[PDB]
Design a protein around this nucleic acid. Structure first.
Lengths: 71, 99, 59, 226, 82, 126, 57, 208, 129
RNA sequence: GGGCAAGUCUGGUCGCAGCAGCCGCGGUAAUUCCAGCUCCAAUAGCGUAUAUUAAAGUUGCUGCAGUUAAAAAGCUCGUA
RNA sequence: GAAACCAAAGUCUUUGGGUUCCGGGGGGAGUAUGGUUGCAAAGCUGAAACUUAAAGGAAUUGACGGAAGGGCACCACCAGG
RNA sequence: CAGACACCAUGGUGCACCUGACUCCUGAGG
């Protein structure tokens, strides 16, 4: 358990929960805006681009195939 | 998890101890986390004594003993079978082999 | 890994061709089809024949 | 074709009394809190409206001296829809055998589960009178009574047990490992049985205790031995 | 366990105890009573009419039971040399 | 070393000894024939091992009952012999020294006796 | 497989047998081999009496 | 109770008790036997209260009574000193006898080479008859037992203070028990004592 | 040292009851303890108690019965305006058919059924059933 | 194919093309692919991507965990 | 309590005595970066991209040990041919 | 217990697989 629970300790609970919230990986990435900055989705849902080149990709094991991507 | 409750002999109610050395492997080990062995043995052993008792004259004296308090470190004490591996149930006993 | 060379594409589709059975009957519309499933399964032939058997099972 | 058979062999006072019909129900036995070591007793008083559900057929194994070894572990649950249920686990060499033994074990273990109400008191029990919790391996299932028409709000494996139990309305919350199914059923089994173990103020009123059926039927149950 | 004014819900009514005031549940082990015979006194020779005490799993596993039985027996009588 | 007796032999031997005690001798040759009469044994080597062990048993048995085996008649005889009376119970033992608290146990049962006093060199028995 | 084995096994035992065993060997389910033993009663493999006492096919 | 003067003890019993060495006990302190104790002998050892030994013995005896078949009380001893003891009890009262090894599983095991059906167990020490004591609480059987100040009291209902190890102590208590049950229901009758001596019980006592 | 006195008393009784023990020594002894015990006693959950008087602070010996299943403490106390009483009652009691939430109201330490009739709320002490 | 409701499908391919949120299939007798056929689910709607919410007692006020799984400051004094 | 254990690691879904500290899958990393203390060596605070459905605990059963007590065989040794 | 106690490194892979219903059916008679 391990928390304070007096008759005036509202402030302490309120701030302690806020401070610990940030630890979680799922929370942190989204709230610091990292998701937008690094990846093109987060702040968009679909996005249109121009094809740079067609790539063949000799897929990393396990599974033996040529995966085949575009850039 | 603890594989020995006392950790090879305890050091509880004592905050630190000095280290003793091994008498045949010379390596530092705590005094009460290591094997301590009294060795009382005759001066003329079971070897010499047979001719020493027959040849002696003008004598009436019971044989001296050599007293030495050996200390062995864990690795040497297991090796040369001062102590040896035992059942995990048997470990909970502080009762050792009689002398 | 990284690579760069495409090789073979549409290999399986290059030797499989589609065909059609057409219709004796239309595939049924809305309410009629929903009712038809309940009748075909239960009120027919009230079930007493067989057990442990699927609608498309070969088991 | 194939057909069943039944045979009675007593090794105990209880078996003889049941067949002679000096005991007419399991409820008497439960009250006196005496064990049941014969499947025939349950078969004789019921033996109809007993549904056996195999909860899982999952194999386990141990490694033998030369290569592998494997066996089937079966979980069977049994119960009427009148407030009696059992659970039996058996492990055997083949799937069929494991379930066959499991059924017998399930019948033997049959225990009354008390049925109560959410708040009602007319129109006959639809849930439990008290919230009951059971734990198995760090899984905890908490059964909470629910009012009529709510239905059983539970995961499939606990819902089936509750159905047999005669609890038609229940809220559940389960916390802990959700990957494990044998534990989940076992924990729910612990919970349902606990309803009798709760002392309610409607159950306070005291009784003068049994004089034991062994003592009273002593003369009757001389057949060649008491 | 009654419902309403005194309608019967219930599958059976369980035994109770008076050595710890706790019910004997539902099929439990180490749950048995203890019929002590009455003697009619004065002319001797057993006459009925059992005194029964109910012993639960709980008391027995906590090794209480010996003392308890005496308290129960003495309080309601009757045994010679009290 | 080799050819220690098996369970099959010993079981049969126990059987035979109990139920045919008076018939059985102590001589291999005659016992071997008795085993033909009182049993069907499908090999001579087996019958010989049975017969053999039964003589060895009879020899031990006729010194009274021996380990792992008993004959009903001998059990009856020991029973009757043991009627043994080692007290009659109190000796009488009246008015002798007793412990100072055992004394108050007699005293408050309307008797009393002579009693030990004083403590010297405790711990007691040491 | 199991139904067939159980029916024949049960019938042979019912006729009067000290015991019996039925083995089905070979492949099943593609490319792996399996054996199963469906046994009931008493069976020996010991010495010369096995030839006399047990009939096989 | 019964007819009543000799059920408040008598000198005859007090002499037999003292002779058989019942009175001495262990040196372990108590928390469940403590009530029974009369007084403590100097520097350890407890003097049991004969008054308490009586009442418990009678309550035990009474529980065997009100069964119309005495066979479904199993008298149990694995102690050597009490093998003869229980054998005599079984002749007298009509108990089903268990002398020497119990052999685990006779109140348990559906498939077994022996099964006994009791309703009440009487034990001579539940730290030697520990197997019956454990087995009984798996199948809902009450157990009386002869307990000293270092015997387990768990799964024992009614304890009878007594040394109950060795000598004539185990014998005498079987004699007195048999005498008591026969008084209420037997053919001694009328709550007066037996014409059989305790010496028929006791141990074998090595025969010269 | 002791920052609540209810919490110690309630535990003490329950732990006794588990054993089958029919006595406890609770202390420091306060007005609220007396009041809680009397309401509890009236409904039959515990047996009678006896207050021994000392100039230390008092000590109470409670003779308890096993008609109780749990007496919990709501520490720290919360306000109840008769529309959080309902929320508590469903949450923390096994049915609405039995058990009492015991509060302190300005019209006296009372069970919540009486509270509902008065329509006087206050601070929640604990509960039992 | 499993989670997942409905193929111990038929032809084709054979770790290739593809499938694949995740677990995993496909290296020749593929119930996962590619077509056909059949069946299932929802039905004028359904699929997909993504934010957020529920499930999640995986942020634990109600209601978390910290001997060993992630986690008691070296220890004490001590003011807010 | 998951067990190993543990009269506390008990009085926890029947969840709540007081107060404090730390954790939120595993790696990147006590690294980067700024600040701070230190003569120095060093100490404190302390990220991200990306990577990945297992990292881990405990017990169970096997296999294996140049770990400890054992036995048995001329497919092993001994004495020898 | 209370005689002697030495170097020695390296090395790869798949298929272990999952449901219940007793006849040789007797076949002169039946």
């Amino acid at each position: 358990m391990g928390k304070c629970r007096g008759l005036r300790t509202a402030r302490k609970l309120r701030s302690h929960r806020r401070d610990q919230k940030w630890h979680d990986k799922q929370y942190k990435k989204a709230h610091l805006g990292t998701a937008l900055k690094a990846n093109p989705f987060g702040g968009a849902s679909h996005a249109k681009g121009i094809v740079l080149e067609k790539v063949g990709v000799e897929a990393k094991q396990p599974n033996s195939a040529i995966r085949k991507c575009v850039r | 998890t603890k594989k020995r409750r006392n950790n090879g002999r305890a050091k509880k109610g004592r905050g630190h101890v000095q280290p003793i050395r091994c008498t045949n492997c010379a390596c530092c080990v705590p005094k009460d986390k290591a094997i301590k062995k009294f060795v009382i043995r005759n001066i003329v052993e079971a070897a010499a004594v047979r001719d020493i008792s027959e040849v002696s004259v003008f004598d009436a004296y019971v044989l001296p003993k050599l007293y030495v308090k050996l200390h062995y470190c864990v690795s040497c004490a297991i090796h040369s079978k001062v102590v040896r591996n035992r059942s995990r149930e048997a470990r909970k006993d502080r009762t050792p082999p009689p002398r | 890994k990284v690579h760069g060379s495409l090789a073979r594409v549409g290999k399986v589709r290059g030797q499989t061709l589609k065909v059609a059975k057409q219709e004796k009957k239309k595939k049924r519309t809305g309410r009629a089809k929903r009712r038809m499933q309940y009748n075909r399964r239960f009120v027919n032939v009230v079930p007493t024949f067989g057990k442990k058997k699927g609608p498309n099972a070969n088991s | 074709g194939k057909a069943g058979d039944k045979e009675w062999l007593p090794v105990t006072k209880l078996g003889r009394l049941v067949k002679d019909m000096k005991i007419k129900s399991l409820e008497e036995i439960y009250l006196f809190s005496l064990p049941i070591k014969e499947s025939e007793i349950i078969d004789f008083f019921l033996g109809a409206a007993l549904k056996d559900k195999v909860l899982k057929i999952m194999p386990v194994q141990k490694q033998t001296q030369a290569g592998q070894r494997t066996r089937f572990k079966a979980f069977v649950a049994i119960g009427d829809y009148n407030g009696h249920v059992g659970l039996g686990m058996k492990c055997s060499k083949e799937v069929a055998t494991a379930i066959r033994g499991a059924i017998i074990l399930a019948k033997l273990s049959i225990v009354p589960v008390r049925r109560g109400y959410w708040g009602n008191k007319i129109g006959k029990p639809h849930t439990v009178r008290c919230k009951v919790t059971g734990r198995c391996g760090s899984v905890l299932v908490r059964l909470i009574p629910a009012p009529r028409g709510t239905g059983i709000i539970s995961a499939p494996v606990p819902k089936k047990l509750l159905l047999m139990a005669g609890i038609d309305d229940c809220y559940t919350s389960a916390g802990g490992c959700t990957a494990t199914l044998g534990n989940f059923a076992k924990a729910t089994f612990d919970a349902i049985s606990k309803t009798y173990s709760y002392l309610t103020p409607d159950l306070w009123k005291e009784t003068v205790f049994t004089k034991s059926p062994y003592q009273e039927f002593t003369d009757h149950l001389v057949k060649t031995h008491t | 366990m009654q419902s309403n004014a005194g309608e019967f819900v219930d599958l059976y009514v369980p035994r109770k105890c008076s050595a710890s005031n706790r019910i004997i549940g539902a099929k439990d082990h180490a749950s048995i009573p203890m019929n002590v015979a009455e003697v009619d006194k004065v002319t001797g020779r057993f006459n009925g009419q059992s005194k029964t005490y109910a012993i639960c799993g709980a008391i027995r596993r906590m090794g209480e039971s010996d003392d308890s039985i005496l308290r129960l027996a003495k309080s309601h009588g009757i045994v010679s040399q009290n | 070393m080799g050819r220690v007796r098996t369970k099959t032999v010993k079981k049969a031997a126990r059987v035979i000894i109990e139920k045919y005690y008076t018939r059985l001798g102590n001589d291999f040759h005659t016992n071997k024939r008795v085993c033909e009469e009182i049993a069907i044994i499908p090999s001579k080597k087996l019958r010989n091992k049975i017969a053999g062990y039964v003589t060895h048993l009879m020899k031990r048995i006729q010194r009274g009952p021996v380990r792992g085996i008993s004959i009903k008649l001998q059990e009856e005889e020991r029973e009757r012999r043991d009627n043994y009376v080692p007290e009659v119970s109190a000796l009488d033992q009246e008015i002798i020294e007793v412990d100072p608290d055992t004394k108050e146990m007699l005293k408050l049962l309307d008797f009393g006796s002579l009693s030990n006093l004083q403590v010297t060199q405790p711990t007691v028995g040491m | 497989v199991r139904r067939a084995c159980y029916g024949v096994l049960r019938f042979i035992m019912e006729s009067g047998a000290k015991g019996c065993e039925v083995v089905v060997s070979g492949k099943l389910r593609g490319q792996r081999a399996k054996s199963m033993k469906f046994v009931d009663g008493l069976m020996i493999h010991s010495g010369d009496p096995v030839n006399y006492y047990v009939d096989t096919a | 109770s019964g007819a009543l003067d000799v059920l408040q003890m008598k000198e005859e019993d007090v002499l037999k008790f003292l002779a058989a060495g019942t009175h001495l006990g262990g040196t372990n302190l108590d928390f469940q036997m403590e009530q029974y104790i009369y007084k403590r002998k100097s520097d350890g050892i407890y003097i049991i209260n004969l008054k308490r030994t009586w009442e418990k013995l009678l309550l035990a005896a009474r529980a065997i009574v009100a069964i119309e078949n005495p066979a479904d009380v199993s008298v149990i001893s694995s102690r050597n000193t009490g093998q003869r003891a229980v054998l005599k009890f079984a002749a007298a009262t009509g108990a089903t006898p268990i002398a020497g090894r119990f052999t685990p599983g006779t109140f348990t095991n559906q498939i077994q080479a022996a099964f006994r059906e009791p309703r009440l167990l009487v034990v001579t020490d539940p730290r030697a008859d520990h197997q019956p004591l454990t087995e009984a609480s798996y199948v809902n059987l009450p157990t009386i037992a002869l307990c000293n100040t270092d015997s387990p009291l768990r799964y024992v209902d009614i304890a009878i203070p007594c040394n109950n190890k060795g000598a004539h102590s185990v014998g005498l208590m079987w004699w007195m028990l048999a005498r008591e049950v026969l008084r209420m229901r037997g053919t001694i009758s009328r709550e007066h004592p037996w014409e059989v001596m305790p010496d028929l019980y006791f141990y074998r006592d090595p025969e010269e | 040292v002791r920052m609540n006195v209810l919490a110690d008393a309630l535990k003490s009784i329950n732990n006794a009851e588990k054993r089958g023990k029919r006595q406890v020594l609770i202390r420091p002894c306060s007005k609220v303890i007396v009041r809680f015990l009397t309401v509890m006693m009236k409904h039959g959950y515990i047996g009678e108690f006896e207050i021994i008087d000392d100039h230390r602070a008092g000590k109470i010996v409670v003779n308890l019965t096993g008609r109780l299943n749990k007496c919990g403490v709501i520490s720290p106390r919360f306000d109840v305006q008769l529309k959080d009483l309902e929320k508590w009652q469903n949450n923390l009691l096994p049915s609405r058919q039995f058990g009492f939430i015991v509060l302190t109201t300005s019209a006296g330490i009372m069970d919540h059924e009486e509270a509902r009739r008065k329509h006087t709320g206050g601070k929640i002490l604990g509960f039992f059933f």
